[PDB]
Write an enzyme that holds these catalytic residues in place. Structure first.
Site, PDB file in Angstrom:
ATOM      1  N   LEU A 130      10.421   9.677 -73.135  1.00 37.00           N
ATOM      2  CA  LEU A 130      11.080   9.720 -74.456  1.00 37.00           C
ATOM      3  C   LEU A 130      11.097  11.149 -74.990  1.00 37.00           C
ATOM      4  O   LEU A 130      10.324  11.505 -75.889  1.00 37.00           O
ATOM      5  CB  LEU A 130      10.461   8.754 -75.481  1.00 37.00           C
ATOM      6  CG  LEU A 130      10.511   7.269 -75.116  1.00 37.00           C
ATOM      7  CD1 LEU A 130       9.525   6.470 -75.955  1.00 37.00           C
ATOM      8  CD2 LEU A 130      11.922   6.726 -75.279  1.00 37.00           C
ATOM      9  N   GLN A 169       5.106   5.857 -68.718  1.00 34.76           N
ATOM     10  CA  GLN A 169       5.933   6.574 -67.751  1.00 34.76           C
ATOM     11  C   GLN A 169       5.290   7.817 -67.184  1.00 34.76           C
ATOM     12  O   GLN A 169       5.424   8.069 -66.046  1.00 34.76           O
ATOM     13  CB  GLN A 169       7.296   6.963 -68.344  1.00 34.76           C
ATOM     14  CG  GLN A 169       8.351   5.884 -68.378  1.00 34.76           C
ATOM     15  CD  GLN A 169       9.696   6.331 -68.920  1.00 34.76           C
ATOM     16  OE1 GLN A 169       9.845   7.415 -69.378  1.00 34.76           O
ATOM     17  NE2 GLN A 169      10.687   5.475 -68.802  1.00 34.76           N
ATOM     18  N   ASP A 207       0.042  -2.351 -89.134  1.00 35.91           N
ATOM     19  CA  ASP A 207       0.944  -1.825 -88.110  1.00 35.91           C
ATOM     20  C   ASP A 207       1.847  -2.956 -87.609  1.00 35.91           C
ATOM     21  O   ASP A 207       1.391  -3.806 -86.846  1.00 35.91           O
ATOM     22  CB  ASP A 207       0.137  -1.235 -86.946  1.00 35.91           C
ATOM     23  CG  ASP A 207       0.998  -0.431 -85.972  1.00 35.91           C
ATOM     24  OD1 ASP A 207       2.247  -0.504 -86.055  1.00 35.91           O
ATOM     25  OD2 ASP A 207       0.423   0.282 -85.120  1.00 35.91           O
ATOM     26  N   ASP A 217      -1.541   1.673 -79.278  1.00 30.99           N
ATOM     27  CA  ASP A 217      -2.861   1.990 -79.833  1.00 30.99           C
ATOM     28  C   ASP A 217      -3.536   3.107 -79.026  1.00 30.99           C
ATOM     29  O   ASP A 217      -4.192   3.980 -79.588  1.00 30.99           O
ATOM     30  CB  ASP A 217      -3.778   0.765 -79.806  1.00 30.99           C
ATOM     31  CG  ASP A 217      -3.465  -0.248 -80.893  1.00 30.99           C
ATOM     32  OD1 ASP A 217      -2.904   0.122 -81.944  1.00 30.99           O
ATOM     33  OD2 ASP A 217      -3.801  -1.432 -80.699  1.00 30.99           O
ATOM     34  N   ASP A 221     -12.096   4.994 -82.407  1.00 30.19           N
ATOM     35  CA  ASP A 221     -11.699   6.393 -82.499  1.00 30.19           C
ATOM     36  C   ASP A 221     -10.943   6.752 -81.225  1.00 30.19           C
ATOM     37  O   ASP A 221     -11.536   7.189 -80.241  1.00 30.19           O
ATOM     38  CB  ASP A 221     -12.931   7.287 -82.693  1.00 30.19           C
ATOM     39  CG  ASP A 221     -12.571   8.745 -82.969  1.00 30.19           C
ATOM     40  OD1 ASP A 221     -11.406   9.141 -82.749  1.00 30.19           O
ATOM     41  OD2 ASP A 221     -13.469   9.503 -83.401  1.00 30.19           O
TER      42      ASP A 221
HETATM   43 CA   LIG Z   1      -1.397   0.301 -83.685  1.00 32.13          CA
END
Ligand SMILES: [Ca+2]
Length: 284
Positions: free
Chosen positions: A12, A79, A210, A253, A267
């Site tokens: 991307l 990718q 999210d 994530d 973290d």
């Molecule tokens: Ca997330």
């Protein structure tokens, strides 16, 4: 700091411009604070892995000229690891390490299902709607548009296409499925990280804000491999020596998305800075 510069790699090319912040959210910043030299290769998503590999080699050649470094430490996602594997296979003297993070190293079952959907290969209509809506929700959250030209990116990530890629570039792939590959192949070090979605959605903390996370859980249910991050099965991520792959995190994530919203107050950035120090401890 690492002897050789770190190169973050993802597909991307237009992500930073279109979205407005990096793919590896906050990660290059963190690494530079620990004194590492860091660069990011953003590769073309809508073409083959071998084309991304050539693109990355040109990036690396220009980078090595500009740094006077001898090699690069690749850290890739999705990718990215395949393109890193192309460069390492063909130009081993310029690659210190390949680290794969949730890499599509043996194909994506979702990519397989999308092809079936596009080809109308007897996929029930209720299944078609859940997958397209999950993908639309993911893309909208990043781009900001309120609306599946995404087949263009998944085409090269099917089990069939990656099996063909692995046939040309087998280095450091595990001998047994879900296993571990050789840590050092032809002088180059290989490491893998991974994750899979875990627990009930209620206890996700940060991911409750999210919108992409619920979408990844829908996609998760369509895999034959139960342990998956929503786009890639756990076993498909394996390449070289395993560090850790049982993180309770979806695919994005693991690159600290969206914009820091992750699972279970983990973290994510610290995974990258601790691995950078580990590479340093291996004289890389
Ligand atoms: Ca997330």
């Amino acid at each position: 700091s690492t002897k050789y510069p770190i190169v973050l790699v993802h597909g991307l090319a237009g992500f930073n411009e279109i979205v407005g912040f990096p793919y590896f959210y906050g990660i290059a910043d963190a690494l530079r604070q620990d004194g590492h030299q860091v660069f990011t290769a953003s590769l073309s998503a809508f073409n083959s892995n071998e084309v991304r590999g050539k693109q990355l080699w040109q990036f690396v050649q220009t980078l090595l000229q500009e740094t006077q470094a001898k090699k690069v430490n690749f850290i890739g996602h999705s990718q990215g690891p395949l393109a890193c594997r192309y460069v390492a296979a063909n130009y081993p003297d310029s690659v210190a390490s390949v680290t794969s993070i949730n890499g599509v190293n043996h194909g994506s079952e979702i990519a397989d299902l999308y092809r079936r959907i596009m080809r109308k290969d007897s996929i029930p209509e209720y299944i078609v709607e859940k997958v397209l809506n999950a993908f639309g929700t993911i893309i909208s959250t990043f781009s900001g548009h309120r609306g599946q030209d995404a087949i263009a990116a998944l085409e090269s990530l099917t089990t069939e296409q990656v099996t063909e890629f692995n046939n040309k570039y087998p280095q450091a792939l595990p001998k047994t499925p879900g296993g571990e590959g050789d840590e050092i192949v032809n002088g180059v070090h290989y490491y893998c990280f991974g994750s899979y979605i875990q627990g009930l959605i209620a206890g996700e903390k940060g991911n409750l804000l999210d919108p992409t996370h619920a979408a990844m859980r829908v996609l998760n249910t369509f895999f034959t491999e139960k342990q998956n991050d929503g786009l890639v099965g756990r076993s498909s991520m394996r390449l070289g020596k395993l560090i850790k792959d049982d993180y309770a995190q979806d695919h994005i994530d693991m690159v600290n998305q969206v914009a820091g919203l992750v699972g279970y107050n983990e973290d994510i950035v610290a995974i990258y800075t601790q691995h950078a120090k580990y590479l340093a401890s291996k004289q890389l």
